[PDB]
Design a protein around this nucleic acid. Sequence first.
DNA 1: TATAACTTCGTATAATGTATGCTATACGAAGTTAT
DNA 2: ATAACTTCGTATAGCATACATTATACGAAGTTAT
DNA 3: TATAACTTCGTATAATGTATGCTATACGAAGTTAT
DNA 4: ATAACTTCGTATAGCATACATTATACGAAGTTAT
Lengths: 322, 322, 322, 322
Amino acid sequence: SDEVRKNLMDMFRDRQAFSEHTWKMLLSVCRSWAAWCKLNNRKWFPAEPEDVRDYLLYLQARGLAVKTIQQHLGQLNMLHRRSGLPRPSDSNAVSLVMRRIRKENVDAGERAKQALAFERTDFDQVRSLMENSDRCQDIRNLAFLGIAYNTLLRIAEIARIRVKDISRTDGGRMLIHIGRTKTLVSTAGVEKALSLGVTKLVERWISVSGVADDPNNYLFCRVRKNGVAAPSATSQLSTRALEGIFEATHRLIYGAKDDSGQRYLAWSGHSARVGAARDMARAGVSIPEIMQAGGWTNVNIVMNYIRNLDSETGAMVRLLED
Amino acid sequence: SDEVRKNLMDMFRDRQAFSEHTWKMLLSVCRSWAAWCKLNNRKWFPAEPEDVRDYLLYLQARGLAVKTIQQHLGQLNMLHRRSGLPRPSDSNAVSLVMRRIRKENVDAGERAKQALAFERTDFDQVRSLMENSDRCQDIRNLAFLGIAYNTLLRIAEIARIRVKDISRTDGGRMLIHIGRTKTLVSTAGVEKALSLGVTKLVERWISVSGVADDPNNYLFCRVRKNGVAAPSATSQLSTRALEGIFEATHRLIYGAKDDSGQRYLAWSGHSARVGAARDMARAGVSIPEIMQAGGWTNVNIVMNYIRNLDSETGAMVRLLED
Amino acid sequence: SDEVRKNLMDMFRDRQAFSEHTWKMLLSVCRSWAAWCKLNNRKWFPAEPEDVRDYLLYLQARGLAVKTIQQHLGQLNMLHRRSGLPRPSDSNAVSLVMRRIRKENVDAGERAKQALAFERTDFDQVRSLMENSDRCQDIRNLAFLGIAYNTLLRIAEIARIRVKDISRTDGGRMLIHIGRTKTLVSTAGVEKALSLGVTKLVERWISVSGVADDPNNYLFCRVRKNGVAAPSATSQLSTRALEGIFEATHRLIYGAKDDSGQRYLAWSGHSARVGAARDMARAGVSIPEIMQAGGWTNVNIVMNYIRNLDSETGAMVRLLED
Amino acid sequence: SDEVRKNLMDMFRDRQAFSEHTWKMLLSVCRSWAAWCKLNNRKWFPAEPEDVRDYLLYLQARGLAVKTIQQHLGQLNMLHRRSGLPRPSDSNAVSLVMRRIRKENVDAGERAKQALAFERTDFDQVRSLMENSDRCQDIRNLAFLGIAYNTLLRIAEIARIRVKDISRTDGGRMLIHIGRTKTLVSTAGVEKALSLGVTKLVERWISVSGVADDPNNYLFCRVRKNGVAAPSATSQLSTRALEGIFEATHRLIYGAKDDSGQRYLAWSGHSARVGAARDMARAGVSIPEIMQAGGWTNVNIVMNYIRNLDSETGAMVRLLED
DNA sequence: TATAACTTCGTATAATGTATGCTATACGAAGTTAT
DNA sequence: ATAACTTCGTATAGCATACATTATACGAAGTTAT
DNA sequence: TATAACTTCGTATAATGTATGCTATACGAAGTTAT
DNA sequence: ATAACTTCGTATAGCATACATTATACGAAGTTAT
């Protein structure tokens, strides 16, 4: 069909309208689905519902997460819907089976994990140790953890901070201007303020890195063996390395990860977000203020991190013994 | 017509998409609709809005509640939508009778109900009346009333408990790990501390019952007319029974049921939930604390349980009393 | 057209799906539009945009409120849309002229008025006088004002209160169950609690009226010359009479209305709502609690009663002199 | 084609549907689009999405802001929608470039701006520098800066003020009745108290100006090079002039403009609004109090003015400082 | 040189929220009028 | 010529109204147990 | 009877918010099993 | 026969997930100034 080619061509022409990660996962899903189709001699593009049902069942049978299976469907759905074709999910075979796969897995324990929390106590411990070190690695890392926990920004937001994004209060606290986040793309964007402590941590790093040469440098950059910063205004510190700082800081305190292969045996990119969310809840911060903290315009995900603070809470118990 | 045959096979094949309670209600509604149709010379499938409209008006004439009339309409919508067919509710005729029937029925003052509060006033009365009775079922029921008040846990939830789900903490207080979640984006297991007095009751029951003798054994079990427990791990105590414990306990104090045929004359499955929440807000406890105690996230409902408390009477009452 | 007749016939068949006031104003607008069409020899049913534009301009030219003109359009729009025909507002002639008429009127002062406030001070004054009277008129009226100001219910909500809708707290305060309001039609509905003062006022009235004979009596009923109540379970006190109580209570204190013909020279049905809203704001009640008070699920109308509390507010002024 | 001729006549005829500022921007955009089309051999009307897409990409290449690119697109959407024609934005091509252009531009860090804060630090500086200067324009400007700080009133709003809109209260404080509303569901006239020091300045100005000599005379008026005021009541001082007072006042202290061509180097119309709000939140004032001071109901905006204040730094900063 | 400390990348899995269309201001710059 | 505007055009920040009902507001006429 | 105190009604004008579709419990009642 | 269930059906209250992305998680391979 002429129209389908056109629609696809249009989406590719302005591919920059979508996150690069959407593209990353579009192609990845397409590769997996392409492969399954080839293994079973099946037309892979206009995808047949029943074929899609077999494929979701096969993903299930490989032991894949409910959420990852929803991903494979999601991209297939997007590829079809933006083509002008009907979505696989538009048929019952796919709809019902997706709902069924979720029900079976969930009803056998499957649960979406969350990042191991990096909370205030963790931050103070990390800091009590590393604040002394005059190494470049250590000063940078300590400053990044500070920002992460102070501001609750995602790591991709942190790696985009430019030195000119930083301003100041009369009070002396650093403010970091963010524009783009996951949930938001604006020109006015948001301001996130650091405490006086974290501001110092960040001053130390600026000072010692020489990022402030060009004010269009990324606040965070790489640091080599010899301890020399490598500022850039065109290459940011990969988010993979910020994941690494979290894994190294965890390793520093708790030693090496298990042999098991499980996710979340050590801190990761999101660890400071669930942790600072959680600390606020427990100090009585109001639910709106928590949402303002993490950029959350809606209430449900925040309830869904105090999710697992829901431990022994024991209101009724006290009531009972008196 | 061939399409809808496919769509109905899609449904039987992926029947595990829905819980067996949904299928139950689906089947029940179809039975009611098909009867009505036969008795009124109407084709039952596909349904035509004129016939669906008369049917909903028959359901109103019959005294059925509005939530009930919605359910019949819902499953009819469901059944037709899961085939290639138009839903009744997408017709102007059925859409207007639902509106007409809703408001009509509220004007004659049909009232949504809820569980009769089983409170602390009531758990002392009961304890008082059978604290030190040595009957093996009097011991079981007393324990279970404990767990239901303390943990505001649903009834199917208490059915599932086992002895392997019971650790300890300060004083003795038992650690009931749970499946309070049957959802993906939701806690990976929750936890409930019993009081010391209630931990004591779920001790004395474990003695007599002898449920410990297997980990995989369910906590609550059947107890026959000879006061002997009958542990199992393939067979959990039904919800209807746990219901029964509550009604029996009501009969104990207040005697035989009021005989209107009405609902919520005795206590039922939820009475302890309702009661505990009310007790909890009476002594002042953060509403979102209450919300976490029985795993609510949709305050519409908990609100309805504590409405007639004096602590909830609102701002105007507060102002007026100067 | 056959379809248009059918659609209209369907709406009339289940007319009870719409408020009777919608019907009242449908016919009233139709009468006015019918009349204008007859005066200008114009087809009145499928209404021509340009004819509708002339008619809105004529309503403007009679000096009618912007909001009343929006009403005439509203019903014309509804009559057409529910017929299956295009709305007048679907054309530019009508759209643009409506927007223009609003702009001209507003840009010459026109503003939507609000009810004269009946606030706490007013209620205490009214009460300081009438609380003594043992007349039936006075006891009833005083109790209605109490409820109005205490609960913020609209008068139609107040006239629907049945004696069985009333319950109690442990604390001794009356609760009044509402089901239907303007913005809401439910079976669970809402509970509104009276203070201890208003509860007394209401006790006096119940006591002295004999409404509590049949518990399906309307809490408020008429009272004749001789001071004898006339309870009914099938005829409520007209909302026009509740408007009258407000006008009489105003007259009692401030004397007779002007000669001017202006609306809101004396208290009316909504006077206690804007007044209690306003009092809450000024005592620092939180904006959510205000919304809970008046049944308001959204924030804008409440801002739009503290609307005209916005008087001399003078935060900046204090700042300036120090 | 005849339809769109009707639709364009509908528009000229009801041209008062929109403000003359909307028409201005509409006309401006058409001029830009038509030029671009001629210069690029494209039909200007109806617009085809391919051509609109290239045009928006030309607007991005030209350095225009995203709010600006939206405006061009908006008026194009408007113009076409008010004819029987499809909007550009309803095409997949233009929809994706707008997305692409938005995020693209935020990544090179284009930043939404706002008025440079004219604060109390700045109104003392100014007063200091010209408190007791006897120049008739130095007297006018000083007064007006007063009114703008004190009342956070927009500039067109201050233009409209007259002497007949000025009563009194405690000490002298002037009573500026206003048209802060140009909306129906909105206050029926508002009110602003000036301070005593500022009331003094709007006294000394009325002396010299001689504006009192007619009620209907506008408060602020033109003052020629011979230090003589020129009252009018048919002619209000333009907004561009009131702007000018602010820039002049900036030049006074800081000298000639920074010469980047940039925006918000001096103060402008809104500077006093911005400044006053910031000052108001600095000394702690309920946010919704601030919101009422300049008639906001959409806190998105006021938030943006007080972001870098230390009192607004958020919960995390508060927790971290123990 | 070997090596820290990356980047790049693939597949795997969590998170996150359900909008614009009109109207005001900003400002350089050209037009107007009386000093 | 120039101060001190006003008018303008193009660039951006700042805001409010439409839609589909459902309700109250009030003067005026008909009703009914005193 | 005249009259308070309505009801009914018409036209006029303000107010008010942008949802369900699945899954659990309630309970009388019939079925089952061991005392 | 009966207590004490379980299973059932029909009646209602109580709840949670789908959708379209955009992001992080982490092991493993290629890179590069020391």
